[PDB]
């Protein structure tokens, strides 16, 4: 499913997202946007050959299994298929044990190059959340 900016906002807001460990809803708005344009099929390979899955690009290395990531872990216990769902429900339970885990936000290269920083507000301009 490609998400409008809007709809992706509620989502994450009615999932919880808006604040989780202080991460104003824009913030996530925009991870989105850089990790997979709002696209819950998005799939990238990393260098090391683990792959990143999602709407955030949650990666094989440490999160979900794909049954190809050698010497990787599942702290998620999720398929990583499962993040690829039209449904953000795994992905939104997933970033939050992610984000919880020491380094807030910037667990998401593309969060801390593109969206740290920035006037995330931006991201949810006009929407009725
Ligand atoms: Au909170
Ligand atoms: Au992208
Ligand atoms: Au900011
Ligand atoms: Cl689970
Ligand atoms: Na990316």
Wanted: hydrophobic share 35%; proline share 2%.
């Amino acid at each position: 499913k490609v998400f409008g900016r809007c709809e992706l906002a509620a989502a994450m807001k009615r999932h919880g997202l808006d604040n989780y460990r202080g991460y104003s809803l824009g913030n996530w708005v925009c991870a989105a946007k850089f990790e997979s344009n709002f696209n819950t099929q998005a799939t990238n390979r990393n260098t090391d050959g683990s792959t990143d899955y999602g709407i955030l690009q949650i990666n094989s290395r440490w999160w979900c299994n794909d049954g190809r990531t050698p010497g990787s872990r599942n702290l998620c216990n999720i398929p990583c298929s499962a993040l690829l769902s039209s449904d953000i429900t795994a992905s939104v339970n997933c970033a939050k044990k992610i984000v919880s885990d020491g380094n807030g936000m910037n667990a998401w290269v593309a969060w801390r190059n593109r969206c740290k920083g920035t006037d995330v507000q931006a991201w949810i301009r006009g929407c009725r959340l």
